[PDB]
């Protein structure tokens, strides 16, 4: 499956980041073999036709284009990062850093809310968007 | 544990490899939608009737639906047993298990 077209070329991915400016660009640097990236792709497909009018999500393979995993240092098996009009917005997840999500978010509503908040912060220009979630914990009990 | 996504990917790959290049340009999404309709049909006791679809395609869709139903039933039973025992779950997992049950 993986209906989201993965930008094979690194320069193609960079141009795609420079392609759209009025919406949210999310790149899934996870390798499609691992099950975690499969769950991330499933979550994206859940929000594929929802956040489409406000965002443009693309997949990525760190093996295909390695420059993204060597310059941005995306060492996680499946890290979700955002870039808005040549500005990598930071989501205030609270996991020590804000460059990636790094978690296999199995909740479609949580992903949709995060996307909406990221879009609102990008519109407001805040480079560090306050994520409306307590991602610092496992959020399970 | 991930039988649903793996089975869907396998069925999609088999259908796409069987499908010709002349039909794999845009009808792959149609086949995926048909599989989704079959899945949602068996989960709500509503019959899935695609009389305009090939008989082997219908057989493959039915086999995939049966496999996914068996996997979902086993997963729901396991999750209900874990919840009754007192395992550590979350709100999303609890909601999904309650819906399946």
């Amino acid at each position: 499956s993986y209906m989201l077209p993965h930008l094979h070329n690194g320069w193609q991915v960079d141009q795609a980041i420079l392609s759209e400016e009025d919406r949210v660009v999310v790149i899934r640097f996870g390798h499609d073999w691992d099950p975690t990236c499969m769950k991330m792709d499933e979550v994206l497909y859940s929000i594929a036709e929802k956040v489409k009018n406000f965002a443009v999500i693309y997949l990525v393979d760190i093996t295909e284009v390695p420059d993204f995993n060597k310059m941005y240092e995306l060492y996680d098996p499946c890290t979700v990062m955002f870039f808005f009009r040549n500005k990598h917005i930071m989501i205030d997840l609270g996991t020590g850093n804000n460059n990636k999500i790094n978690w296999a978010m199995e909740d479609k509503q949580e992903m949709v809310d995060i996307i909406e908040t990221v879009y609102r912060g990008a519109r407001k220009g805040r480079g560090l968007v306050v994520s409306p979630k307590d991602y610092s914990t496992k959020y399970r009990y | 544990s991930h039988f649903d996504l793996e089975l869907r990917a396998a069925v999609m790959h088999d259908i796409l490899d069987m499908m010709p290049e002349g039909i794999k340009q845009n009808k792959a999404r149609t086949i995926l939608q048909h599989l989704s309709e079959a899945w949602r049909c068996w989960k709500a006791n509503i019959p899935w009737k695609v009389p305009g679809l090939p008989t082997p395609i219908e057989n493959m869709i039915l086999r995939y639906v049966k496999a996914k139903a068996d996997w979902w039933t086993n997963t729901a039973h396991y999750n209900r047993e874990r919840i009754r025992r007192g395992a550590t779950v979350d709100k999303t997992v609890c909601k999904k298990n309650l819906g399946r049950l």
Partner: peptide
């Protein structure tokens, strides 16, 4: 289109 990528991913898993 997506068929080739899906087949490639399936063949490695």
């Amino acid at each position: 289109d997506i068929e080739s990528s899906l087949k490639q991913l399936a063949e490695r898993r």
